[PDB]
Structures are given as structure tokens and as C-alpha cells.
């Protein structure tokens with residue numbers, strides 16, 4: 001078959017999200033700077049650009065035209081060996097997002113890395129995955145990932161999927177989602 | 188859909204095999220000990236047990252009942268960042284395989300890591316993937332991986348897929364494949 005998105009979503013979960021998401025808040029709290037910070041939403045914001053592509057660096061990127069996003073630092077690494085085959089270390093990037101004259105937000109942002117495979121396939125093997133087929137697979141990936149994560153009680157409230165077109169301002173998108181997050185001051 | 192194997196094979200390729208396989212021989216040759224060794228087949232032997240499972244350590248494992256496999260060392264690491272999201276280091280394990288009184292072989296062996304996801308699914312989400320459905324997905328994974336790798340000229344002669352039942356002696360299986368490999372003394 002050609003429905004690559006199903007496999008991408010399941011491996012994204014079992015090979016990463018399943019064990020990083022429940023532990024994320026605790027990992028963040030291991031850093032005093034992060035304990036001290038208010039307006040720090042602890043959910044992982046998983047970024048899903050409709051074009052399966054992004055600048056390697058989020059701050060100042062085409063998705064950040066107003067330069068309101070700044071890299072703050074990384075969380076303390078989680079160590080895990082995968083079936084005794086290879087060793088992995090997992091850590092996440094914290095970003096500051098400006099909110100005018102108010103206190104800026106801190107948040108966890110990450111592009112959905114399985115999208116790299118969709119993009120690579122469309123460029124290296126166009127016969128297997130056309131641009132239009134890639135577009136559709138993004139949607140399939142999103143819907144399956146939603147089903148998987150929503151089926152895991154341990155992941156509840158630990159993430160937020162963010163879909164957007166490449167013409168959008170990520171800072172604006174994120175600011176709105178951060179304000180709509182459950183986190184209140186002192187929380 | 189439920190055909191997870193397709194996605195597993197494509198990401199295994201684009202996220203790993205596509206860039207490690209063409210460089211493998213060169214990476215191995217960076218170590219003098221490996222340059223000096225004869226009967227060192229430079230192909231990556233990708234192990235695909237029919238049950239999607241293995242002991243973390245290959246030497247002395249249930250797949251090595253005669254204790255003829257020994258860990259020798261790792262290849263020099265390859266560094267690569269994945270879309271600016273996370274940093275990876277790739278390296279491979281070299282094993283010695285006893286050949287009676289003759290000179291023992293050196294080889295590169297590693298289990299097909301996407302099988303971890305198939306196994307994890309069958310145990311954690313049996314409703315999504317039954318034992319019997321997992322068995323079938325192994326076959327789908329194998330055949331799709333074959334199609335992908337055979338379609339990449341840069342990967343030609345750089346790998347060998349090894350399928351076996353868990354009751355088999357991996358040392359016997361490997362000895363057979365090493366002798367049948369193209370590599371000749373001084374090659």
C-alpha cells in the first residue's frame with residue numbers, strides 16, 4: 001500500500017511520545033529556572049505544517065516574521081536504549097514567545113518529525129508520493145496520531161497538536177493557544 | 188488503515204538506512220583493527236526474527252545457544268541532525284563469529300529496529316494488532332523494505348536481510364551467509 005502515515009504515527013508514539021509525554025512536566029521541573037518561571041505551559045506543542053517542511057531553526061524563521069520567538073534552552077535529557085540496539089537521549093527545546101509589554105510565555109515546541117519522511121519521500125521518490133499525495137498523508141497522519149494519543153490516558157493534557165499553513169505567523173498561532181491553555185498563574 | 192509495516196519500512200530507510208548503508212564500509216575502515224582484519228564482511232546484516240523479538244544482547248542469547256557470537260566493538264559514530272529538531276549519532280556493532288578452528292569472521296549485525304514497534308503494538312494494543320496480524324506485518328515489512336532498498340543503487344551490495352524463526356541458531360545462519368558473501372580474502 002501507499003498509506004505510509006499510519007506507520008509513521010504508530011512509531012512516533014511507541015518510539016518517542018509514549019514515554020516522553022508522561023514525564024515531560026517532571027523533566028522540566030528538574031531545572032530551577034523552569035520552576036521559577038510563570039506563564040510556562042508544560043504541554044508539548046507538536047507542530048504540523050501543511051507542507052511537511054520547516055527551517056531548522058524556529059526563531060527568526062519564515063514562520064516567525066516578527067522575530068517574537070527565542071530559543072531559551074533544553075530540558076534535562078532522558079536516556080533510553082532501544083532493544084539493546086542503539087542508545088538514545090531525549091530532550092526538548094524551550095522557547096520564549098513575546099507577548100507585547102506583558103510577561104513573555106515559555107513553551108515546549110517541536111515539529112512533528114515523521115513529516116521529515118513524508119517530505120523526503122516526495123522529493124526523492126515522487127513516483128511513490130506525489131506532492132498532492134503528500135498533502136493527503138499529512139491529514140491521515142494527523143487523524144491517526146490524534147486517535148493514538150487520545151487513547152492513552154497517560155498522555156492526556158500533556159500535548160497539543162498545532163496544524164498551520166506555511167503563510168501563517170507561528171508566534172500568533174502559539175500566543176493564542178498558550179492563552180487558551182488550562183495553565184493559570186501559580187499553576 | 189492497519190497496514191503499519193509500510194510506514195515502518197519507509198521511515199527505516201529515509202531516517203536511517205539511506206545514509207548509513209552507503210557510508211558503512213568507509214566508516215569501518217576508519218578503525219585500524221578493522222582494516223587489518225580479514226574475513227570481515229562489510230555488509231550490514233539486518234536481522235528479522237519472525238516473532239519481532241530478541242534478547243537485548245546477541246552474544247550468548249537464546250539465538251546463540253553455542254555461544255559462538257562475541258561483541259567486538261563499535262564503528263566510528265556518524266553525526267546527523269534531523270530537521271534541526273534533535274541530534275543523532277549513528278554507529279554499528281561489530282561481532283566475531285566462531286568458525287571452528289579456522290579464523291573467525293567479523294561482521295555487522297543489528298536487529299531491524301522497526302520490529303520493536305510491531306512488538307510493542309501487539310503487547311500494548313492487542314485490539315489494534317493481534318499476534319497473528321503481527322506475524323503478517325513482519326512479512327509485509329520485509330517485502331516493502333526489499334522493494335525500497337533494491338530501488339536504491341547506492342545501497343546495492345551494502346546489506347543483507349536475514350529472516351529466521353526464534354528456534355534457529357543465529358550463529359549457524361550467519362556462518363552460512365558469511366561464507367556465501369562475495370568477499371574474498373584480501374578483498
Ligand SMILES: Nc1nc2c(ncn2[C@@H]2O[C@@H]3COP(=O)(O)O[C@H]4[C@@H](O)[C@H](n5cnc6c(=O)[nH]c(N)nc65)O[C@@H]4COP(=O)(O)O[C@H]3[C@H]2O)c(=O)[nH]1
Nearest residue numbers: 011012015016085086113114198199202203272273300301
Ligand atoms: N522530536 C523528536 N522525534 C523523535 C525522537 N526520537 C525519535 N523520534 C521520532 O520517532 C520516529 C521513530 O523512532 P523509532 O522508534 O526509534 O524508529 C527508528 C528506528 O527504528 C530506526 N532508527 C533510527 N535511528 C537508528 C539507529 O541509530 N540504529 C538502528 N539500528 N535503527 C535506527 O529508524 C526508525 C525511524 O527513525 P526516525 O526517522 O528518526 O523517526 C523517528 C522520529 O521521527 C527525538 O528524540 N525527538
